[PDB]
């Protein structure tokens, strides 16, 4: 019943700028409901979220779980291991899913699964490894039949046979080093001479733009096996957050960073005011860190460190103001007393 | 009377496309199985080995095969298997699954069919902890494939000398092995013959020349491959076949999306020109027919996102330009 | 510490230590502090063969 | 001795040997003495491009 526009609006409240990824998830979730409403067999298209650090992959999933009537779980690929080893088994994901559905098998098969840090199980090289990849390739192999569809045994609290042909899988990870792979395939003009195309570090293809030209052969060289990529046919890319986006992240979202510190200072008894000029400076410094939106927390804290250290001892403090200079370190935040 | 191989192939053709060689092999083996069942000299069973690239139709053949045959059919994944005594799974578990389909009828289960997918995932590595999921599983299967009594809880003893086994997997890297052995050259002079990448034989053309020694280098035990004398090879895919997968099969993508839009109140139409373009793109992805699903999704993403909001929409048409992204799909209102 | 499915202690073991000090009170352990010393010892040094997996 | 996660050995094994002499009395072992011989063998070669398990 819910339309993708409605779903994207819920995500837009918490996620800024990932229009393409919000469309894919909205459409997939809507199609999941459509496919769910009907009991010709309708196949499912699994998603693959590729984006840089601090782009909103895990955030999109968390925002999705809030509005998802069907069971949603969010697993991790690091803990997984090939069957027969001490590490957590791949089937545990299904067990985790049942916990959300009160151990209802019919309600679990209709679920959505998010797998984060999928890039951590990738093979080291394109060619098969000569040693057993317990936490890498082995996990990919075991996931194949899970995504496409098979029956899995789950210990209830005998085993419970849970099918996965209808379960949706959203495997997302920050593929680091994939941009280099794409550049080799897309540039093909490296060299030293005149005919060669020599460009500077600046004014060249960025990581965000390169991922937009991602194709399976690129992921193959990164380590993902061909069988695994076929299970995940829908590839959604998230671009690097621009300064304009970061400025919005600080105030527009409901659980924004500025609101977090305001709540902290408010329960303490102090008001916190961020001037518009300051938010533009924080974004500039953050981009330099190349850590995404998370970089904002590093700037803000360093700017209010001394303030937070001296404020509780201080008395009769009702408001704090942070102008652009405070970020640069050439000034001290202004304080207003009662 | 019992069905003839021609009839079996017709049933498979309804859901499978472009695997004439393997379809014959499976139909022949299945027909022979019924002949042995009626004749309950002792006839021997030929185990099958399905080798094909991703999205070629191996698992599909097995699923379609199960639908028409009466005898018990069980689908197993070699990944979950482990050496006896470990916590992953036991090889005899396969038989247990079989009995569920046979309702714990041994006489009806010994005459059954078994399929083992992802067989290439239990290969042998080059390290000296014990590879519980590799060589150990192969040795345990040898006993199962050759024929022996296995204890299964309802324990029950179930012979396996008569059970048929169809082990198939997408052997990746096997093409490289064959190329070394078969594609000699790489000189530097005038007389020498350079690679000439365009000329390079693709996996489909390269796997047809497979021999048992090739599988040895891939990591399979010799006794294992010997037990499986038959080797059915699948071509990667053909662009003509890709265009057929979208229209001829029962559960084709076009029919899926048409049903999707239909329950929503919209009739989706695909033009022949578009299907040719989608097939071309799919072949470039080198992920089989499954990659084809992505292209369709992308071309329809914007549409499916804005379709419910739209009102008085009775039909959607996808042109060749829509696939490339230059144009927007046309709509017809009511 | 080591990657999952290896001989070394698992990362989750840290939380176990926390529970021991918290008398296995999960509600009191989710509010704890953790200090991971020698964090420089888990860094890929540079320019090494990628055939092997840096599990440490 | 080798790095954690490798086939050779773990450094905690030393304490186990110490406990053997202490009859598995932790309080008696926590105040023990250890002699690590051949310490020169655990040495580099400056930084190292690859991991030195031993």
């Amino acid at each position: 019943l819910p339309t993708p526009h409605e779903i994207r609006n819920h995500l837009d409240d918490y996620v800024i700028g990932q229009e393409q990824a919000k469309k894919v998830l909205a459409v997939a979730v809507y199609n999941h409901y459509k496919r769910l409403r009907n009991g010709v067999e309708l196949g499912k298209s699994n998603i693959l979220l590729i984006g840089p650090t601090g782009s909103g992959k895990t955030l999109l999933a968390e925002t999705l779980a809030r509005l998802l009537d069907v069971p949603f779980t969010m697993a991790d690929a690091t803990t997984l291991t090939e069957a027969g080893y001490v590490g957590e088994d791949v089937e545990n994901i299904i067990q985790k899913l049942l916990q959300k559905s009160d151990y209802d098998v019919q309600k679990a098969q209709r679920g959505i699964v998010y797998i984060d840090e999928i890039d951590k199980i990738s093979r080291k090289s394109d060619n098969p490894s000569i040693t057993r990849d317990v936490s890498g390739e082995g996990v990919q192999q075991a996931l194949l039949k899970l995504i496409e569809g098979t029956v899995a045994a789950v210990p209830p609290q005998e085993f419970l046979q849970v099918d996965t042909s209808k379960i949706l899988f959203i495997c997302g990870g920050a593929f680091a080093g994939l941009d280099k792979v794409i550049s080799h395939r897309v540039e093909t003009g490296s060299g030293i001479g005149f005919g060669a195309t020599v460009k500077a570090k600046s004014d060249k293809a960025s990581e965000g733009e390169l991922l937009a030209q991602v194709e399976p052969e690129d992921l193959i060289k990164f380590g993902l096996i061909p069988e695994f990529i076929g299970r995940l046919p829908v590839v959604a890319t998230l671009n690097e957050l621009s300064e304009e986006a970061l400025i919005q992240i600080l105030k527009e979202p409901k659980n924004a960073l500025t609101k977090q510190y305001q709540a902290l200072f408010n329960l303490e008894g102090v008001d916190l005011e961020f001037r518009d000029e300051a938010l533009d400076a924080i974004a500039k410094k953050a981009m330099a860190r190349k850590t995404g939106a998370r970089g904002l927390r590093s700037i803000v804290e360093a700017a209010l460190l001394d303030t937070m250290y001296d404020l509780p001892s201080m008395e009769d403090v009702e408001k704090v103001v942070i102008d652009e200079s405070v970020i640069d370190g050439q000034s001290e935040p202004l304080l207003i007393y009662g | 009377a019992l069905p003839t191989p021609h009839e079996i192939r017709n049933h498979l053709d309804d859901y499978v496309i472009g695997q004439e060689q393997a379809k014959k092999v499976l139909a022949v083996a299945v027909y022979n199985h019924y002949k042995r069942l009626r004749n309950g000299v002792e006839l021997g069973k030929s185990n099958i080995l399905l080798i094909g690239p991703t999205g070629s139709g191996k698992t599909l053949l097995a699923e379609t095969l199960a639908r028409l045959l009466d005898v018990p059919f069980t689908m197993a994944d070699a990944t979950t298997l482990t050496e006896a005594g470990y916590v992953g799974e036991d090889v005899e578990n396969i038989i247990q699954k079989l009995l569920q389909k046979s309702d714990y009828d041994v006489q009806k289960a010994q005459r059954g069919i078994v399929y083992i997918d992802e067989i290439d995932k239990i290969s042998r590595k080059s390290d000296n902890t014990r590879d519980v999921s590799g060589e150990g599983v192969q040795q345990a299967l040898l006993k199962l494939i050759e024929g022996t009594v296995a204890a299964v809880p309802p324990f029950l003893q179930v012979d396996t000398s008569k059970i048929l086994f169809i082990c198939g997997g997408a052997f990746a890297g096997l093409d490289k092995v064959i190329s070394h052995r078969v594609e000699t050259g790489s000189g530097i002079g005038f007389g020498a013959t350079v690679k000439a990448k365009s000329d390079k034989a693709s996996e489909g053309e390269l796997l047809a020349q497979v021999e048992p020694e090739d599988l040895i280098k891939f990591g399979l035990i010799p006794e294992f491959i010997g037990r499986l004398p038959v080797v059915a090879t699948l071509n990667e895919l053909s662009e003509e076949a890709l265009i057929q997968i979208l229209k001829e099969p029962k559960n084709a993508l076009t029919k899926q999306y048409q049903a999707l839009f239909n329950l929503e109140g919209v009739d989706l139409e695909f033009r022949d020109e578009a299907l040719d373009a989608i097939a071309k793109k799919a072949m470039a992805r080198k992920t089989g027919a499954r990659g084809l699903r992505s292209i369709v999704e992308a071309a329809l993403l914007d549409t499916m996102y804005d379709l419910p909001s739209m009102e008085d929409v009775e039909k959607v048409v996808i042109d060749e330009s829509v696939i490339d992204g230059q144009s927007e799909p046309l709509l017809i209102y009511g | 510490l080591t990657e999952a499915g290896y001989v070394g202690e698992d990362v989750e073991n840290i939380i176990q230590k926390l529970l021991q000090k918290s008398d296995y009170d999960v509600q009191k352990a989710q509010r704890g502090i953790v200090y991971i010393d020698e964090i420089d010892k888990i860094s890929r040094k540079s320019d090494n063969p990628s055939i092997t997996r840096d599990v440490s | 001795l080798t790095e954690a996660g490798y086939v050779g050995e773990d450094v905690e094994n030393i304490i186990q040997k110490l406990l053997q002499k202490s009859d598995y009395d932790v309080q008696k072992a926590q105040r023990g003495i250890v002699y690590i011989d051949e310490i020169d063998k655990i040495s580099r070669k400056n930084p190292s491009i690859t991991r030195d398990v031993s």
């Binding site: 080893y85 | 005594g85 916590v87 014990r130 | 290896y6 | -």
Partner: peptide
């Protein structure tokens, strides 16, 4: 059964 822990070499 008994879980196996792979010990990396070299």
């Amino acid at each position: 059964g008994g879980s196996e822990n792979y010990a990396l070499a070299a």
